[PDB]
C-alpha cells in the first residue's frame, strides 16, 4: 500500500532523530519527545465520560484501528468497554489539548476481540480490532502503519534488534508527558523473557527492554498499553508494527521486561475480521 511511509520523513527523504539507532542494530519511561509526524499511525483511545486517556492504539487502514484486548475487556478489574464508551483521537502530538485543525476524532462502529484472548491467566492473544464509524482522511499527521508478512517477521524479530514504542503514558512507575514520547528498545531472547517472570509466556508474545547490565533503560508505562511496537525494514524502508504494548510488571524495573502481543502470529485472525466485516 502506501503504509509505513511517513509524509514528513520517508516521503521527503528526511530521517527522524533516532531511526539510525534501529537500523544500526539490524545486524513511556526514559524516552524523549516525539518529533511532529514521527508516528502518524499513533492513536489515542479516549473515554467519553469521564474524559480520560484509556490506552494507545494504531491506525492500520482508513477504517481500522488495532489495540490490546485488555484495553477494552478485563473482567478482574471490572473493565468492559463498548463502542459507545469510547472515542479514537488520531493525528495527535499534545497529550491533553484539542488540536484544532490537526487531529481527527472518530466514533466506533464495532469492536472485535480475539475469541481466544486469555484474560484469566496470561493475557495470551491480547489483541483487538476496532472499526471506525467513518473513514479517516490521511494527512501529514495521519498515516497507516504496515502489518508484517512472514518474511518481514522472520528477518526483523530477532534478539538484539531494536524496535520503537510510543505513547502518552506516565513517565515513571511511581507524571505524564505534555507531548507524545518515544523510546527505542531491543528485543530479548525468549529464555531471558521466561526466566524474568512467573507468568506463563506463549508464542503469541515477545519481550523487549534493556537487561540490567546494558546501562540504558526504558519501558512502556500506564497509559501506553495497546500502543504500537514498530520496526523499520532496512529492505523497503517502511515501518511495520511488530507488537502491541501488552503487559509488564511495573515500569522500567531492573530485571523485568516489557511484553508485547506478537502481531504476525495473529495476522490470520486480523485478515479474517477485516475480510469478513
Amino acid at each position: 500500500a502506501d503504509c509505513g511511509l511517513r509524509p514528513l520523513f520517508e516521503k521527503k527523504s528526511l530521517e527522524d532523530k533516532t531511526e539510525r539507532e534501529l537500523l544500526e542494530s539490524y545486524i513511556i519511561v526514559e524516552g524523549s519527545d516525539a518529533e511532529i509526524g514521527m508516528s502518524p499511525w499513533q492513536v489515542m483511545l479516549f473515554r467519553k465520560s469521564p474524559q480520560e486517556l484509556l490506552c494507545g492504539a494504531s491506525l492500520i487502514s482508513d477504517r481500522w484501528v488495532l489495540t490490546a484486548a485488555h484495553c477494552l475487556l478485563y473482567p478482574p478489574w471490572d473493565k468492559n468497554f463498548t463502542e459507545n464508551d469510547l472515542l479514537v483521537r488520531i493525528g495527535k502530538h499534545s497529550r491533553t489539548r484539542y488540536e484544532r485543525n490537526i487531529e481527527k476524532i472518530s466514533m466506533l462502529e464495532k469492536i472485535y476481540i480475539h475469541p481466544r484472548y486469555n484474560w484469566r491467566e496470561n493475557l495470551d492473544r491480547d489483541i483487538a480490532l476496532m472499526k471506525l464509524k467513518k473513514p479517516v482522511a490521511f494527512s501529514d499527521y495521519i498515516h497507516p502503519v504496515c502489518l508484517p508478512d512472514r518474511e518481514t517477521a522472520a528477518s526483523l524479530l530477532q534478539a538484539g534488534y531494536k524496535g520503537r514504542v510510543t505513547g502518552w503514558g506516565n513517565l515513571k512507575e511511581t507524571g505524564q508527558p505534555s507531548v507524545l514520547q518515544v523510546v527505542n528498545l531491543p528485543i530479548v531472547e525468549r529464555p531471558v523473557c521466561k526466566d524474568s517472570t512467573r507468568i506463563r509466556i506463549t508464542d503469541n508474545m515477545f519481550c523487549a527492554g534493556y537487561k540490567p547490565d546494558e546501562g540504558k533503560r526504558g519501558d512502556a508505562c500506564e497509559g501506553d498499553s495497546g500502543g504500537p511496537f514498530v520496526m523499520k525494514s532496512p529492505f523497503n524502508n517502511r515501518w511495520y508494527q511488530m507488537g502491541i504494548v501488552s503487559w509488564g510488571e511495573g515500569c522500567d524495573r531492573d530485571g523485568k521486561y516489557g511484553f508485547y502481543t506478537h502481531v504476525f502470529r495473529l495476522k490470520k485472525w486480523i485478515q479474517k475480521v477485516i475480510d469478513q466485516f
Binding site: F46, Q51, L53, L87, Y98, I105
Partner: peptide, 9 residues
C-alpha cells in the same frame, strides 16, 4: 484534558 467538540460527547 481540554474539552473536545460537543459533537462527540
Amino acid at each position: 484534558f481540554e474539552a473536545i467538540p460537543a459533537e462527540y460527547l
